[PDB]
Each structure stands twice: as C-alpha cells, then as structure tokens.
Amino acid sequence: GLSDGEWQQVLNVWGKVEADIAGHGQEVLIRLFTGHPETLEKFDKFKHLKTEAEMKASEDLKKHGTVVLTALGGILKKKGHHEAELKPLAQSHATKHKIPIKYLEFISDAIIHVLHSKHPGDFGADAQGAMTKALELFRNDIAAKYKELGFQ
Numbered sequence: 588g589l590s591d592g593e594w595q596q597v598l599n600v601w602g603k604v605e606a607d608i609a610g611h612g613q614e615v616l617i618r619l620f621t622g623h624p625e626t627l628e629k630f631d632k633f634k635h636l637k638t639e640a641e642m643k644a645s646e647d648l649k650k651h652g653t654v655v656l657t658a659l660g661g662i663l664k665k666k667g668h669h670e671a672e673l674k675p676l677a678q679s680h681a682t683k684h685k686i687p688i689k690y691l692e693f694i695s696d697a698i699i700h701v702l703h704s705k706h707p708g709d710f711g712a713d714a715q716g717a718m719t720k721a722l723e724l725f726r727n728d729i730a731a732k733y734k735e736l737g738f739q
C-alpha cells in the first residue's frame with residue numbers, strides 16, 4: 588500500500604527508465620544473470636551465454652529486457668490496481684516458466700542496483716523507498732497467486 592506521494596515518486600523514477608527502456612532492461616537482466624547464475628538456467632534462449640561480453644552483445648537479451656520492463660511499467664502505472672495485468676504474469680511464471688518467488692526478489696533488488704548505477708546521485712532516498720515499496724507490492728501480489736496455485 589502506497590500513498591499518492593509515493594506513487595508520484597515511483598512514476599517520476601520510471602520516467603528515467605522510459606527514456607532508455609532497452610538499456611535499462613539489458614542491464615537489469617545482466618545484473619540478475621551475473622549475480623545469480625542459476626537464474627540463467629530458466630531461460631532456454633539465454634543459457635548459451637557464458638560471458639558477460641556475450642550477454643552485452645546479445646540483441647535478443649536487450650529485446651527481452653524491453654518486454655520485461657514494458658510489462659512492469661504497465662503494472663506500475665496502475666498504482667496498485669493491477670489485478671488484471673498481474674494475473675497472467677503470475678500464472679505464466681508459476682506454471683510455465685517455474686520461477687520461484689526468490690528470483691522475483693533477486694530481480695527487484697537488481698532494479699534498485701541498476702537505477703543507482705545509471706543515475707548516481709539522482710536516485711534519492713525517498714525515491715528508493717517508494718520504488719522498493721512498489722516492487723514489494725508487486726512481489727506480494729504475485730506471492731498470493733503462487734500460494735493459490737501451490738507453487739514453490
């Protein structure tokens with residue numbers, strides 16, 4: 588649950604992402620894959636990537652980064668009223684991709700890391716607080732659907 592002022596911070600930060608969605612999406616996935624190499628094994632189309640240089644050179648990884656952040660941005664713009672947008676993603680990630688909630692924690696922290704890396708000194712403590720709360724809400728509502736499905 589976020590206040591109006593917190594949502595305003597989230598959507599202000601998101602403007603930074605929308606200026607370069609592919610570059611942000613690429614770096615988020617690279618941070619996930621290099622920090623948590625077990626996550627790469629869930630992607631049949633990226634498991635061939637052995638080095639970060641190959642990851643950086645992969646145009647399909649940048650494409651998928653655009654898909655991921657476009658979906659997340661659509662959810663964030665609903666300011667919590669995201670049941671219709673979130674349900675299909677919860678279902679596909681639990682039942683088809685088999686993504687444990689832990690990996691959603693990993694990618695949430697990766698987003699925070701990338702924002703500081705690309706905007707050092709321009710991602711203030713209030714903005715980090717609000718973005719963190721928004722990603723916690725996203726993860727918590729996914730977790731509720733995971734529990735319904737019995738997925739661990």
Ligand code: HEM
Binds near residue numbers: 630631659684
């Ligand atoms: C912010 C969190 C995430 C968002 C918004 C997101 C979004 C998406 C979307 C929109 C798709 C394509 C449609 C679909 O299959 O539902 C997708 C596919 C997929 N996601 Fe995610 N995802 C997220 C996190 C993760 C994480 C953490 C993992 C694994 C560590 C993951 C694994 C996958 C896989 C394996 C696919 C299929 C890729 C393919 O072969 O095309 N997702 N995701």
